[PDB]
Amino acid sequence: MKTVITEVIASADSQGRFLNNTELQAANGRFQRATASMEAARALTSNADSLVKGAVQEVYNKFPYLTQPGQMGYGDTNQAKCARDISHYLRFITYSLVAGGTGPLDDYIVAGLREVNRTFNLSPSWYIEALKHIKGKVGSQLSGQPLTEANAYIDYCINALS
Amino acid sequence: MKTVITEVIASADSQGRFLNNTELQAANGRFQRATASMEAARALTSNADSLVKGAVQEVYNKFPYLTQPGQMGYGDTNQAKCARDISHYLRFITYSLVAGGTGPLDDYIVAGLREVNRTFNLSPSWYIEALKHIKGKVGSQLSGQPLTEANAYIDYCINALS
Amino acid sequence: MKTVITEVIASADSQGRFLNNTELQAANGRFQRATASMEAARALTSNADSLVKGAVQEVYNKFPYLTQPGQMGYGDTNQAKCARDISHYLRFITYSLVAGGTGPLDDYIVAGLREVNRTFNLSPSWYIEALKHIKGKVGSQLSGQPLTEANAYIDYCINALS
Amino acid sequence: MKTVITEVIASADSQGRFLNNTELQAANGRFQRATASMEAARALTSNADSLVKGAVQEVYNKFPYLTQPGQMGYGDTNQAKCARDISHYLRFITYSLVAGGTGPLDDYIVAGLREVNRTFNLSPSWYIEALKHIKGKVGSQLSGQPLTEANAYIDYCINALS
Amino acid sequence: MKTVITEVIASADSQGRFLNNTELQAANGRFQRATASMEAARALTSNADSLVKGAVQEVYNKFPYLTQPGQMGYGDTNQAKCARDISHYLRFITYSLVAGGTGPLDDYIVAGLREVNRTFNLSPSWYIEALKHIKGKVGSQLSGQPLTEANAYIDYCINALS
Amino acid sequence: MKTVITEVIASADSQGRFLNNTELQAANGRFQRATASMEAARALTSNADSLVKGAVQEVYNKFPYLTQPGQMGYGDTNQAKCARDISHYLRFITYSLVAGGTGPLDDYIVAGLREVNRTFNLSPSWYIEALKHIKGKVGSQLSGQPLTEANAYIDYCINALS
Amino acid sequence: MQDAFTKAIVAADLRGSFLSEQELNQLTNLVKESNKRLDAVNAITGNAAEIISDAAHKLFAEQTDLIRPGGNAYPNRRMAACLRDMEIILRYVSYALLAGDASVLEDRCLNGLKETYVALGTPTRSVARAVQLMKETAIGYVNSPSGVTRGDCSALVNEAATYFDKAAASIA
Amino acid sequence: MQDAFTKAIVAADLRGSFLSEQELNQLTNLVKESNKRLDAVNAITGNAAEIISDAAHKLFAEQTDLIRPGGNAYPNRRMAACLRDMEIILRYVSYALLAGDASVLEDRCLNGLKETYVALGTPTRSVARAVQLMKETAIGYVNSPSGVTRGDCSALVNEAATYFDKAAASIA
Amino acid sequence: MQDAFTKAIVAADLRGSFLSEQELNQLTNLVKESNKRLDAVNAITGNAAEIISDAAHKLFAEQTDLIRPGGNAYPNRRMAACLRDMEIILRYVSYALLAGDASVLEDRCLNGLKETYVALGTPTRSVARAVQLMKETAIGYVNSPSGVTRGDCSALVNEAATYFDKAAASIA
Amino acid sequence: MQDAFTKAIVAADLRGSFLSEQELNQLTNLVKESNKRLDAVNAITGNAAEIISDAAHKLFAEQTDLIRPGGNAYPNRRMAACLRDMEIILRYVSYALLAGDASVLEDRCLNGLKETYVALGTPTRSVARAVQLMKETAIGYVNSPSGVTRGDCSALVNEAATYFDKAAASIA
Amino acid sequence: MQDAFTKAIVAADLRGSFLSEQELNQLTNLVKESNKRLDAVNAITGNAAEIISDAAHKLFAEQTDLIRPGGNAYPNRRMAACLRDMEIILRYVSYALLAGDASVLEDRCLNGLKETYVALGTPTRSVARAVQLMKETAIGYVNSPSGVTRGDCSALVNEAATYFDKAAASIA
Amino acid sequence: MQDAFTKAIVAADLRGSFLSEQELNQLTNLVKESNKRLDAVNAITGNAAEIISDAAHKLFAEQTDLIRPGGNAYPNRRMAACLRDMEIILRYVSYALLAGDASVLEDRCLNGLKETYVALGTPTRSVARAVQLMKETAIGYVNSPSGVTRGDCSALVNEAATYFDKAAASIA
C-alpha cells in the first residue's frame, strides 16, 4: 500500500540495500507532513455526514434528469447506493491523508474503477461533480497545508475519473 | 545520481505516472533537511585542509610500519596520493550532504572501489581509520542535525569499505 | 486487418507452413458468405444518409437534455460532429461486412475508443443508443442472412462500447 | 487436434476474446464442406481392404528387390506390418476428412515420422509410392469435391514424406 | 569449428576466465594424439583415389538395381556425383583427423545432411554402405591408434546418417 | 566439480550429444597428466606439516607487527587458525592436483573468498605471502612436470587472491 | 483440444478402426444442425456484455454481503476480478458450444478452478450462482433473437445448459 | 496484413467514403472466381516439395559453380539454407495468391531480402533464377491438376506469375 | 539523472573542487523557494487531465485536418496515441519542474523524438503547437490555484515555460 | 506491504469506518516519536557491517563445529552464504523498524525460511542464535550513539527486539 | 558433478584430511586402466544408433502391445519419444562410464524419472526391459570391437552393467 | 572459431583438396613445439593479475591526466572499467596463443572496439599504450619462468607479440 515509508523501503529492498540517508530524509517529509494531513483528516471525518449529503444532492441538481422515474437517481436504492459510494470516496481520502500517500485510493478505488463503472452504467461525471462540490465546501473547513492536502487527494480522485 | 528528488521521479516514471502527494511529501523531507546538511557541508568544506592532514597522519600513527622504506606510506608520491584520496572522500561527503543522498558517493567512490583497491594493494583498513579519525574531530565542529548528517555519510563510507 | 483470409494466413505463417485443407475450408466460408454480407453492405450504403439522421435524432430524443444550451448536443458543431461519428460507425460496419471480419472495426474504431471518449467527455450510452436505433430500422431493409450479418456487426460495436 | 473449429477457438482464446463474425464465417466453411469430405470418407472406408492390398503390392512391383530373401519386403511379418502401415495412413486420411483438418494426420503420423522411419530403416519412397497408387485408384471411386478432398489429404501425406 | 583447442577456449571465454590447468591438460591430449591422427590422415590421403572407387562400386554391388536404366546409379553424371560425394566424406574425415575433433564433419557434412538428402532422394543407406566398405579396407592400411582414430571418424559419419 | 572429465561431459550433455573423439582426446590429456600431478600430490602431502609451519612463520617474518599484542598474529587462537587456513590451501592444492582441475579450489576456497576475508579483516597479502613461500620451498621437493603442476595450482590461488 | 468430431476420431482410433456408420451419422446430424449452432453461439457473443451485467446486478441483489467491506466483491479491484471471471467462464462456454464438446471448458477453465477460489477465500457457492444466472439469461437469448428463422433449438439449449451446469458443479 | 478486400477498404477510407459501386463489383468478381483461386493455391500446396525439388535440380544443373567448393550452395549446411529459402518464398507466394494481394509477400519476405543476401555474399542473380524456375513449375501445376473442373485459369496464372516476378525483381 | 544540485556537483567535480560559495548560495535559494516549487508541480499534477484535454480540444479546433481521414489524429487509435504523447510530455515537464533541471526531459523524452515523428509521418509542427497549448494552460494553473498563500511565482513560471519551450523547439 | 498506518487503515476498512479517535491518537504518537525512530533505524544502518561481523565472530566462538569440515559454515562458499543471510535478516529488521510493523519481515524474509533451512540441512538453532547475537549488538548501538539528543528509547528498543525475536522464533 | 576422483576428494574432505595412500592407489589404478576405459566409452559412442535400434526391434518383438493402438509406443509421436528416451539413457550411461561414477546418471537422468513415467502412463516395466536390452548389446560391443589390443575388459564390462542395472532398477 | 589447424583446413577446402604435404608438416611442427606453447600460455595465466597491475601502475605513471578529474580513468568506476578491459584483452591474447591463430582475438575482442572507445570518449592512444605495457611484461614472463626446461622460445615470443601488436594497432 503506497506510502512514503513503503515506497522507500521497496526501493531499498529491490537493490538489496539498507535504508540510507536518502531514504530517511524522505521518511522525515512524511512524518513532518502528518500534522497538516491529520487535521484535514479530522475535519473531513466529522463533517462526513453532511459532505456526503451535499455532494449526493449536487449530483441530482447538476443532472436534474437523474431523479425522474426510469432513471438511475430514482428510488431509495439508487439514492442509497450513491450516498454510500461518495462516502466510500471520502473514507479513502481520509485514509490517504492519514497514511501519507495515495495507496488506499489506488488499491481500493482506482484499481478496477473503469471496468466496474462501465459494467454498471455509472458515469464518472457524477462522481467528478460530487468531488468538485466536496472540494468547494472543504474550502471553508480548512486552510493552509491541511487544505492543500485535502485538495491534493480530491483532485487525485478527479484525475483518476478523467 | 541518487537523491531524494531523482528517486521519487524515477519511481513515478517507471510507473508512467505524474508525481503525486506521496512523492511531493518525500521531496519536502529533502528540502526541510537541506539546512542541517548544508551546515555540515560548509564546516567540512573550510576545515578540509586540516581534516585531510589529520586523517593522513593517523593512518601512519595507527599503521606505523607504513612509513618505513619499501612500504606504501613512504616517499613523497605515496604520501601525496594518500592525502589526495582522503580529500576525494571528504569532497564526495560534502557533495552527498549538499545533494540530499548518497549518489555522489555511490557513483564516484563506491562503484568499483574493491576492484581498484585490490589491483593497487590498497587496504581498506587505512581508509576506515582515516574516516574514523575524521569522525572523531567532526564531533566538535558540528552538533545536532548537522553532526548527524556528517556522521550518516562518514559511516556510509566505512560500511562501503567493510 | 482481421479477415478470415488474413487470419488463416497468419496462423500458417506463424507455424512456417503452407496453407492446408483446414485453412482453405475456412476461406471457403468467407467466400460463400460474401453474398449475404455484401447485400447488407449495399443496403446500409444507400440508406446511410437517413440511418445517420435517424440515429442522431434518437440520441437527442432519448437524452432530451443534450439539446439544451451549455450541453453537448447543442449548436451546429456538436450536432455536426455527432452525425459524422455515427456515419463513421456505419461506414466501418459496411467495411467489416465487405471485408469478411471485424478488422476495420477493430483497427479504426475499437482500438483506442475508451481513451478518446473519456478525454472528450463522450458517453458510450449515446453511441449504443444510436446503434440500437440503427438496428431497429435495419430490421425492415434486410432479412435472412444479410440481416444476421448486419446485426452481427452492429451488436459487435455495442459490446465494444459496454 | 487441428480442425477449422479448434483453430478459430484457439485464436479467440489466445486474444481473450469471444468468437466473432470472422470466426463463425470460418466455421461455416468447415460445415458446408462436410458433405464432400464425408463422401470421400465413406468411399475410402469401404474400399479400404483393396486400397491397402493394391498399394502394398505396388510397393513390391515398383521395388522388385524388396521381395527377395534378406530384404524388408520378405516373410510374413514384414509384408504384414506393411499392409498395417498403409492401413494406418488410409485410416488417418478418413479421420482428417471427417474432422475438417489435418489434425489427425499431424498428431498421429506426421509428428515423429522421420525419426521413426530413420531408426527402423523404412524408406519414405515406399510410402510415397503406396500413396501415389492409392491416389490413382481413388480417381474412379470419387469425383468433384469429394475427390479434391481425398487428393488434398493424400498429397498432404506425400509432402510430409518428402 | 569444434576441436579440443576451440572447445576449451570457448568454455573459458564463456566464464570470462583465463585458461587454467584443467584446460591446458585437455589441450595436451589433443597434441599428444596428433601423431596417430596424422598417420591415419596420410594413409587415407594417398589411398583416397582407390578408397573412393572401392566404396562407389560397393554401393552398386550392394544395391544392384541402382545401375539399371531409370535409376540413380545410372549414367555418367550420377556415378560421377557419387564418387565426388564419397570423396567429400573421406576429405572431411582426414580434416577431422588433422584438426583434433569432429568440427569439419559437423560444419560441412552433418549440419543440413538430412534435409539435403531428403530433397534430392538420396538414401543414407548407400552412404553407410560406402563407409562400411571404407572401414573394411582401412583395417589393413593402419593399425593401433591410427586405426582407432580412422574408425572413430568413420563410425561418426555412420551414426550421423542413422 | 571442475575436472577435465566433468568439463567434457558437461559440454556433451548440454548439446544432447554422445562423447566424441574431441572429448575423448581431451580425457586422455587428463589421464596422461596424472603421473606428474600425483607425484606433486604425494610430495606436498608428506611435507604438509613443515610447508605449513614454514609459510605461517613467513607471514609473521614479512609482517613483523602482526605478532605484537592487540594484533591478529597474536595469541594461540589466531596463530592456530592461521596454520589451519594455510593447511586448508595446501589440502585443496593436493586435491586439485589429484582431481585434474581447479574444481576443488574453485568450490571450497575461491567461491566466497573475498566476502569472508573482508568480514573477518583477513588481508589477502598474508595468504599470498604464505603461498609465495610455499612456492619457494616446493622448488627443491619436485622438478619437471610435477613442479609445473604444483606451480600451476599455487599460482592459481595467488591470482584468486589478487 | 477436442471438438465433437475429434472426439469421435479418438474413440475410433482406440479401437484401431475406421469410424463406425453409427458414429458417422451422429456427426452427419451435427452438420445438419450447424446453422442453428452458429446462431446459438452468435446469440451469446452478441449479448455477452449484457449477459454478464444482468447476471451481476442479480448476483449482488441476492448476496448483498459480497459488496460490503469484508465481502469478496469489494472494493473496486475485487469487483473487477469477479466481473472478469464471469466473462472468462461465459467465453469458454461459448467455445464449447461452437465445438460440440466440453473439453476446452474443462481443460482451460474448470481444471483447478475450485482450488484456486478456496485458496483465495472466494466463496465458491456465490460463484456457482453467478454461473446459474448467466445460464438463465444466455439461454433466454439463444431462444428469443433478431429475425432468426423459426424452429426448434431445445437440443442446443440443453447442451448449452450442461456446459453452464458443468462449470457450476465443478466450482461450488 | 492486407487482402484484396482490405486493400479496397483502405483506399475508400482515405477518401472518407463508403465503397464505390466500382470497387464493390471488382470484389464481387473476386468472390465469383474464388473456387478457381482455392484450386490454384491448392495446386501449389499439394506439390510444394516437388516444386522446390525440381526448381533446385534445374538451378544446379545450370549453375554448377554453386555446388563446388567456393560456391554458395556448398557444403550441406548452405544447400539446406538455399533449399529452405526456396520454400519460404514459395510459401509467401501461395499466401499472396490466397489473399489476392502481394502485401504479405512484400512485407514479410521481400522487404530487406536483397540486402541480406548481399551482406551474406549470396548471389542474388542465382536466387532470382531459382524463383523463375519455381514459377515455371508452380504454374505448370496450377494449369494441369487432378480432376478439377475444366475452365480458364489464365487470369489467376498471370496473377501468380506477378508474385513470382515481384520476388525475382526485388532480389536480383 | 540530474537535479539542480546534482548539476552543481558535476561541474564542481570537473574542477576537482568543493562547491564554490557562489554555487552554495544559488542552491540555498532553491531550497528557499521550494515550497513554491512544490505548489507549482502540484498545480500541474492536480489538473493534468484537463491540461491535456483543453490543449487537445484547442489543437483540433485549429487544425481540423488532423481529424479528417488522411489526418494524423484519425482514427481512434491515432487520436489515443496523440493524447498519450501529450500526457507523456506534460509528465516529463513536471518531473523537470520538481528537479530544477531539464535533463530528465531531454534524456528520456526529447532525445530522438523528432526523428521518431518524421519516420512516422506525424506532423511535428502540430505536435509543437499542442505543446504550446499545454504550456498556456499549465502556467494558467500554476498562477491561479486553490487557497495557496499569495506571493510571486513568476521565476518558476518562467522556468516551467522553458521546459515547455525546450520540448517545442526540440520537436518542431 | 504494510506500515503502522496502513495497518490501522486496513482494520478500519474492515469495519466500514473512518479511523477511530482511538486509532488516530495512537498514530499521532508514532509521529510524535518519529525522530527517535529515525535515529534507531540510523543506528543499525550505520553499523550494519560491524553488527553482522561481531555477531559472526561470537557465533563461531560458541559453535566451533560449524567451521569444521562437516559443518554448515564451511568452506568459504558456505560461510559467505551464512554471512549473507545474517545481512538479509538484519536488513528486513531495519525495514520493519522504519515501518512500525513486522509485515515486510514476515512476508519477504521469514515466510518459508525455516523449511528452506531444513531442506538445506542448515542448523536452524544456530541460525536462531546468530539472530539473537545481532539483536544484542544492534540494540547496543540503538542505545549508545554519536551525539544524539539524550532521552528514552526503550519503547523503540523493545519493538526492535520483538522483530529480532520474531525472526528467531520463526527460524529455530 | 562427480567423477571417481572428485568422489575420493569429497570423502577425504569430510575427514579434514589429505587423501589416504589407500585412496591414492585406487585412483592410480583408474589411471592405469584408462585406455581400456576410453575404448569402452568409444565402443558405445561408435554404435549408439545400432544399440538403440537393436534394443528397440527386440523390445517390440517381445511386447507387441506397445505398438497397437492403446499402446504406449503408438502412434509415431510416442514411438519417437520412446526412441529418444532410449538414447538419453544410453547417453548418461556412457557419461558415467567415462567418469567412473554413477552420479551424472542418477542426478540428471534417473532422479524423478519413475514418477514422470507413472504420471504419463508409460509402462515402467517395459522401459526397464528396453534398458536391459541396451545393456546386452552395448556390452556386446565393449567386448568385441575393431582392432583393439587384446586384453581383459571384464572389470569395465561389470561397471558398465551396474550403470545399466541402476537405471533399470530406478525405473521399473 | 579458428585455430591453426582449422585455418589450414578452411584453405584446403577452398581448393577442394586434401591437405598439402606442405601444410601437413607446418602443422606437424606446431605439434612439435606444443609443450613450449603450453608453457607460454601458462606463463601468462600464472601472472595475469601482476601483468595487468604492473601495466597499470606504469600507464598512470606516464599519463597522470587519466587519474585527474576530467580523466578517463577517474573516478573508481572508470578505473575499474579500465582495469577490466586490460584483463579482457590479455585474456583473448592468451586464447590466441593457445590456438596459434589470432581469430578469436579479432572476432570477439578487437572487432568494433575502436569505435566503442571513440563513442565513449576513451582515449584510444592511452589504451594502445596499456596494451604495449602488458606485452612487455607478459613476454618478460614467457621468457623467465619457474624451472621450465631451458630452450629457445623466441618463435613463440614473437607470435605472442604480434597478438599484442594486432590489438594495439586495431585500437590506437
Ligand SMILES: *[C@@H](C)[C@H]1/C(=C/c2[nH]c(/C=C3N=C(/C=C4\NC(=O)C(CC)=C4C)C(C)=C\3CCC(=O)O)c(CCC(=O)O)c2C)NC(=O)[C@@H]1C
Ligand atoms: C485452374 C485453377 C484449374 C481450374 C479450376 C476450376 N475450379 C472450378 C470449380 C470449383 N473448384 C472448387 C474448389 C474448392 N472449393 C473449396 O471449398 C476448396 C477448399 C477445400 C477448393 C479447392 C469448387 C467447390 C468448385 C465448384 C464446383 C465444381 O467442381 O464445379 C472450375 C469450374 C468453374 C467455377 O468457377 O466454378 C474451374 C475451371 N480449371 C482448370 O481448367 C484449371 C486446370
